[PDB]
Amino acid sequence: IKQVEDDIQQLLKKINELTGIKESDTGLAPPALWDLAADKQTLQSEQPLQVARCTKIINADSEDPKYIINVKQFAKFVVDLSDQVAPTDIEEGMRVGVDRNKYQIHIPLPPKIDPTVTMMQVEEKPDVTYSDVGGCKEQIEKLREVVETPLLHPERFVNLGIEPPKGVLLFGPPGTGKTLCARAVANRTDACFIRVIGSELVQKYVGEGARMVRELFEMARTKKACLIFFDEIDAIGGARFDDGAGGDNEVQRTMLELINQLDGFDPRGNIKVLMATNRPDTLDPALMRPGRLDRKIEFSLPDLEGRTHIFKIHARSMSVERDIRFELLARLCPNSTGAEIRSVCTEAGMFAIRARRKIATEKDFLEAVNKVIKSYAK
Amino acid sequence: IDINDVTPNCRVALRNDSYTLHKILPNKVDPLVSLMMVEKVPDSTYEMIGGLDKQIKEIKEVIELPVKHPELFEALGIAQPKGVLLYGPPGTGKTLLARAVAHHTDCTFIRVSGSELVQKFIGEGARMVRELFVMAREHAPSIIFMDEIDSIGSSRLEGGSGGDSEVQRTMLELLNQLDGFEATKNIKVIMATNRIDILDSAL
Amino acid sequence: SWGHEYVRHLAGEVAKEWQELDDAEKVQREPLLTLVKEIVPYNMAHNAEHEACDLLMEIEQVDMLEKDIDENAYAKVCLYLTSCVNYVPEPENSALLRCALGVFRKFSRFPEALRLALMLNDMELVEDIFTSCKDVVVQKQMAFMLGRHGVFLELSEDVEEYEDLTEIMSNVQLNSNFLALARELDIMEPKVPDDIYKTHLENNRFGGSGSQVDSARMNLASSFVNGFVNAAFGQDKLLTDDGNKWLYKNKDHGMLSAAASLGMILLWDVDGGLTQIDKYLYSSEDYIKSGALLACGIVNSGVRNECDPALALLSDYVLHNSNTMRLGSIFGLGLAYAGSNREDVLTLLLPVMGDSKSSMEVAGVTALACGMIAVGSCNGDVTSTILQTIMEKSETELKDTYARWLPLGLGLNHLGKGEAIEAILAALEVVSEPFRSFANTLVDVCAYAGSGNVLKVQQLLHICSQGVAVLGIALIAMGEEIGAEMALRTFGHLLRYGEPTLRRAVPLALALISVSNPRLNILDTLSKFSHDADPEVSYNSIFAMGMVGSGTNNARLAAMLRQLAQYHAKDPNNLFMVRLAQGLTHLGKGTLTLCPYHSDRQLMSQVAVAGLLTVLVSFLDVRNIILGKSHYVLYGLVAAMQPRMLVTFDEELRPLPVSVRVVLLAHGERAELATEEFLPVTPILEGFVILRKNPNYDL
């Protein structure tokens, strides 16, 4: 029954496309297909590049009318009179423009400030919002002021004549909500969260590493308003001042290259940088220094009242009987950060499940402390 | 010709203006490792060198009999023995004895050199240790001699840990799972050493 | 036995064999029929309701159901049987609902009879339920709930324009025998409910929108949005003052519109509203004359009382030469009669119908005006006129748009109607049209309240191998559960055809189902359809999106409105369509809503769907294929309105607050899932209800 319909669907699309390919075939054509994953009522006529792929390159200029710009190993051929209109923007090549190398060839579109080819994680908006707040409370308050507020109300900052920082720093243990906090603002702030793992950027062969740093920044510039999330930069973050001793130079080159882009001629833009370190101490003075790093946002030993808010979050899912109060126990319990506070609770539900009861009890809670006290000490 | 007629890894003739298989030629193999030397016939025998006499029966009884005849063991209620280690003074004639054994056993002698499995090329080393096991299974029965941990001196290096033992250790773990998912083997591991101090705690 | 295979084996076996014969055999006679009955109460006791319910399906008598029970709740057994009916067999008749309706009443579960009564509501049912009520409480509770949205007692106050269903109340009032009161009657045909809605709209407000501004296109959008936003309370002063600068600037359809917008602010005031409009209506400019007529119609909506006889004006135009003015008066007149059939309105329309209008006035849209009224009661006169116009094909082939409308008109007159449609079907099948073949499935579906059948789905593939086939699908999903799964399947076929007409029709069909619960996945597929080739398809899509979010004001509704906003200038038409949306969004104010599903009875509303359907094909001229139609159809959106609010009246003109559990409102605002702390003593109901616990809680 379905089958008849499916056959009719191929056939109708086929006849219209055959006519279009016959036509497109004449005069040749660019890189070889259409992929849609936007809308067809918004179509670009600037396409990203850093090299010029050419396939024909038909154009209008007086000194010749089908001028080409390559740099490729075989056919690196170029314009016959320098700097005369060639690519037709991104006609017959889809990234034809100009070569980074240069041969005094025309630039309708630049070889820098483009997304180009990449290896990237861009991660569309999260879903999380408040999940360990209580001692993560301070960290929230400041992060909104730094990241969100400039994008929400920029016009205000200009009247005053103040410009906001470009980077903030995160430290303390990950997966305690140090980590959550960066995603939680990413979802609220509505700007693309771009996740680069510094350790990945590290490569087997030199110069490549610099190349990567550069590529990231060109993309970053184009899109204006974005967040670069650096996962535990210490691999190519500082430790280091020793000036080589055998490929401690290669990692240092990447670290120095990043500085160039930051301190350089670029300016901030709407670009925000979140850095992630273990203990901030590791990192070098150049990475610390103002005119790139200014605010360092911290974590902390959570006050008692705080613990309760986290427990309060947890208690909506967890079947309870409220006639007992967790805060009294919590004063007696070891002082520990947010992650252990959720974990003891999580342990508590299991004992119930064995007991063959569906509601929490005072009894469950007593048990959890003995295991947990043991677990840090292994 | 039809597609049932082809069997993978055949050299073939393709036309150049019609691009159909006119004929199929004979077959072809590939060295994925930077040194392939498999011996299906031996370089040793019993009377290869003399004075081995006390030892011949002892190794024989350990290795040959379970592979040749699995049924007697199965009946008695014992599990197959996984791998054998030989230790003694350097490369006196020890290696030869292994190759004599593969001939008698009527299997392939596969010498894998441990350090030839690791590459400065990206990912190729990790793939290499695992990849070999699958090959042996098609080849089965087989002898895997870990080469380069003691030799006569036909092939460089006597001893090595952390990359002759470490790759060999991996083999022991692959086999442990194998032992859980089957009950008859035909893959033997041969280790050769002189040293008792090349042996890890895990070993 | 008493609860094993054994008992069920015997009873079912005796039943099935006997029934077929059309005889009393050896296998059963009257004491043998009693032996079948004995197995049903044992299973009830055991609470093996699954066995009991199937036996009730097989015996094929609902007399047996009553016999079983003379103790315990009637109501619990019946609901389990009603669910079991839709699932396992796919039932074909509307009998099964009607039979079901009586059994609830005995125990006094009149709210369930009311839950079920709405949709597929026949002239017989409303009366059957009423006869059974002889309790003061139940009597008053129906009067509020029927008051909310009539369709056989309309929202008429005092003008009789029907073929009698209002007279049950008159007769019972003289000497009370089912407890029809003089007071009760106000609730029953609404003055006081209509008044209360109006007050809520008036209080809550929502300020002005736009400025005077420049340019024709921008002026029109602004005046149009202003009129929806400011749908209640007199702030009309701002338009009238500057009526030179603002109103006049617009030309073509737009000047008519500009004038009409004052009617929108005036909406619900019969007296002051119509009268103020009348000054501009006689004399002034020819545009101002038409634009007024439209404005009288919008004010008049959702009631039959008047202060400007529309019939008088419409009559005059047939006599004179005013062809342009006449078109508009009929749309006006269509709003004014508001869903009430009357032979007079039908007579008046008929000579204008009779003539071919396609280039005499650049429209023959008049079928939509005829349609909106023709939802509510089926009479002989109406039926006969529609059949004949289609039969001719003298206006059903001229423009292709008209060709969908006259057939569609038949279905709209036959919506929710019982046994009376069988007569028509035979007549339809004999004349041949490309349209009528789709129509066979469509006549059944409007009357029955859906029919999904595998054979029905397949018949549809063969004819394909056009608007009218596609709209019908939307009905079947709205109806039964099995009808829903089959619809999804039916729409799969449509997506496979790339054919341009087929492509255009489908987003509308989705839009019609998904406005009763807005949902995120149906909206993404319509957004894709918007972005594919051809302008006409893209227009139909952007409109569909606008409809689908319509429900709880600025909720999920905000995300869907934003979604329209991104493609507000991929056509100049798009820009207009999107401004219209902003108007529609602030129109409700949380007193009224658009959502065929309300949670006062927890079911769909027959009228609400009908309102939304007429606007749906051709809102504007610039929409779809441009064969010369109108923009007027847009005013039609008022019809669809349903109030969803919690207001309690503990007598029926004396409110008393109730404590609200699911909040703390009994005037203004809205409540999701209304519940009371003190709920009726046994005719337990939410929405507009009497509380017979009569609580002294105050806000």
Added chain:
Amino acid sequence: IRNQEQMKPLEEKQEEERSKVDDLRGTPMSVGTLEEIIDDNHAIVSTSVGSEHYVSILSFVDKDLLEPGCSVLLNHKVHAVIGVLMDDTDPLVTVMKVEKAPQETYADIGGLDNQIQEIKESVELPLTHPEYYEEMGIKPPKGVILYGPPGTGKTLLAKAVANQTSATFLRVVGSELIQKYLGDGPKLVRELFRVAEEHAPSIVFIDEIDAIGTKRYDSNSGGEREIQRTMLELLNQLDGFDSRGDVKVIMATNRIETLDPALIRPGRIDRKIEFPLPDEKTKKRIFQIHTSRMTLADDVTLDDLIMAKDDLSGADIKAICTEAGLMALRERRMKVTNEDFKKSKENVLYKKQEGTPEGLYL
């Protein structure tokens, strides 16, 4: 009849479509690669041929099955998409076998019982019961750590558990992730995670490493950088994304006091599972199953050998029997005697000890 009607125009239309594809399909068909996906109806392609031609895609193949860097078929002079290539290589990642439902069960070991309930409650139990996790509102632990002198019951228990749990088991050798090559090691851990995600739900058995033992107080060092570079990415994967069941982790280490608390992270791992030492009674239990398999005799004194034993786990025990069994086999008898048991018990005792005693605390 409804079917017939659809059928009459259809049959030809059905053939016509097949003729139309065959025109494209016409030999040869060159493989090439899609460089990147440019969503405004474009894409970057690298051709090793020469010509490229921007075409509309066929309706069998869509762009939703096109991924960046994919291999696709191009014609050699009209360079159009017939189809995407369906021939993909071997997982190139570090040593893995995947196995659905292994032979072994956990009824063979005995006297270890408590530990067996611990893994049970964590891994097995949520699969068995949805709604028990809903009431509580939480996940069973993501991962556990099994710690003891190398697999005498650690290893046993894992094999057993995969059969029970009825999902894909993947066992990875962790040492093998270590490479002395800058790129290789990180690429492997990221491929290991990639492979998990496809096969989900899945069980990850991590065989012990040296590299989880070292963190120092630097976060990277001028020493062997790679082992910590790798260690970090293990963490990032874990503290980035929590599974209730999509990935279940079994971790194994000889000693857990080597490990780092960073590595544990409470609220992923909450369970630490400890195999007790050899306890006297247990030795007899484990043994009774091993002898059953083998021939047995009426001159065997089961207790006497167990009594003579002290501080020996199941593996040596499994081993003693196997050794003895070989001696018997040489004699060509299937009868077992005391004597056999004595020589084997002596060999294993000879080899383990050369120490001096710390007893006599009385």
